[PDB]
Swiss-Prot record, chain B:
Residues passing through the membrane, by range: none
Gene Ontology, cellular component aspect: chromatin; intracellular membrane-bounded organelle; mitochondrion; nucleoplasm; nucleus
Alphabetically ordered keywords of this record: Activator, Disease variant, DNA-binding, Lipid-binding, Metal-binding, Nucleus, Phosphoprotein, Receptor, Steroid-binding, Transcription, Transcription regulation, Zinc, Zinc-finger
Gene name tied to this protein: ESR2
Organism expressing this protein natively: Homo sapiens (Human)
Protein name: Estrogen receptor beta
Gene Ontology MF terms: DNA binding; DNA-binding transcription factor activity, RNA polymerase II-specific; enzyme binding; estrogen response element binding; nuclear estrogen receptor activity; nuclear receptor activity; nuclear steroid receptor activity; receptor antagonist activity
Any one biological process term the GO annotation gives: positive regulation of transcription by RNA polymerase II
Effect the entry attributes to changing L154R: Found in a patient with a 46,XY disorder of sex development; uncertain significance; shows a higher positive regulation of DNA-binding transcription factor activity
Length: 221, 224
């Protein structure tokens, strides 16, 4: 019942992470990095509140968290930036516009992928309910391996899909359009995965250790 | 309009399928894969040009899509011809590799595992021949965001191929909830194809045949 469409969406609503303030006393990358570390903590809490997630093997839980985190953060970023072209609302005291991305090399390229994907969600008029479904799906779909408890993950992923399909249905649009909107949303996931891969590569080409800090949190989990 | 109809479209993509590519071998594993990719790219252009309406996009978009997708389309091809043989990758008729051979070159094993794992999901879903034809066109048409944010034309084309896939899934006979679930399951896999594509690109650029520059030459010739 907790995985019933309407109930599931309300449950994901309440599970939303709080606002994160970095509280600033290289530096741009310092801030982004301090932010990620803080957001990751709340991201774990968020996942655990997704009905059934805690019931997957701890193996799958850790697996999913480890490979999704960057995507989920960027999905979050895109959603709070969605109404402001040219800008990225990373956090309540960290708003960066595109050009601030020229400072650090390699980043401008990523800002442009994030801004372009956000632009696309804006054009589709992504709803609050749809966004809650898509973000859970990003988590649940982040890793193939735990799927090829696997029974449980597949069932959970189907449940969230049903909820997204349900959300699209009460849209009142025709059945052809419903299929098209589902397809348009899911194809955007490719692009969120893409920006995620670019941001990971760049983070690792860098000389705060988010990834190791994440692994500590995961061992804590 | 009618040439983009679900039935005609699937048949048109069928005929547009690239030929078998023989690498014809007289570092080495990576030499082979690289010489193969280069040969496949030529035919991939031809393939794209046969997708109804592709040629009627701006040359700028045609080049954007081709440059962004090529690795994904290649890997989509790989997964499809490997789909019935777990543990193996049929790259080409004289180049079959199994997981283990991926240990030789460093970094490659991880990619093989992503490819093999994605191929296994396509096998579990029982990907159909005409579903595969639709998905691979979608991979091309959805490879780059920028050309969409002639943009009217690309969105129309992307909708036509999607309609065709939805149509393919419909005549499957299954219920309406399952049709939605199948569409969703297929498209979520695109994320994993994109992913393997990104790992394979990164690995290719960390290397010391120049596939990407050779692609840009082909792209300039396509342009001239
Ligand atoms: O809510 C958040 C969402 C995403 C992030 C990431 O932060 C870093 C940090 C170091 C690094 O090298 C790459 C990145 C990537 C790429 C990006 F576009 F700059 C932002 C990404 C952080 C918080
Ligand atoms: O049909 C084909 C499909 C994909 C390819 C690619 O070939 C190279 C070549 C050099 C390199 O550094 C990376 C890769 C990636 C990664 C991979 F898994 F090894 C195979 C990929 C080639 C032909």
């Amino acid at each position: 019942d907790a995985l019933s469409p309407e109930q599931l969406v309300l449950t994901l609503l309440e599970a939303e992470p709080p606002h994160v303030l970095i509280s600033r006393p290289a530096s741009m990358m310092m801030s982004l990095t301090k932010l990620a570390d803080k957001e990751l903590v709340h991201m774990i809490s968020w996942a655990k509140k997704i009905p059934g997630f805690v019931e997957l093997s701890l193996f799958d839980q850790v697996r999913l968290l480890e490979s999704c985190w960057m995507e989920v953060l960027m999905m979050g970023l895109m959603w709070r930036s969605i109404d402001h072209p040219g800008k990225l609302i990373f956090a309540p005291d960290l708003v960066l516009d595109r050009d601030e991305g020229k400072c650090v090399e390699g980043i401008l390229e990523i800002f442009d992928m994030l801004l372009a994907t956000t632009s696309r969600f804006r054009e589709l008029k992504l709803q609050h309910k749809e966004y809650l479904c898509v973000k859970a799906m990003i988590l649940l779909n982040s890793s193939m391996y735990p799927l090829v408890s696997s029974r449980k993950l597949a069932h959970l992923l189907n449940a969230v899909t049903d909820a997204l399909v349900w959300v699209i249905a009460k849209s009142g649009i025709s059945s052809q359009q419903q299929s098209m909107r589902l397809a348009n949303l899911l194809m955007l996931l490719s692009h969120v995965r893409h920006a995620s891969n670019k941001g990971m590569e760049h983070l690792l080409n860098m000389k705060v250790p988010v990834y190791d800090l994440l692994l500590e949190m995961l061992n804590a989990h």
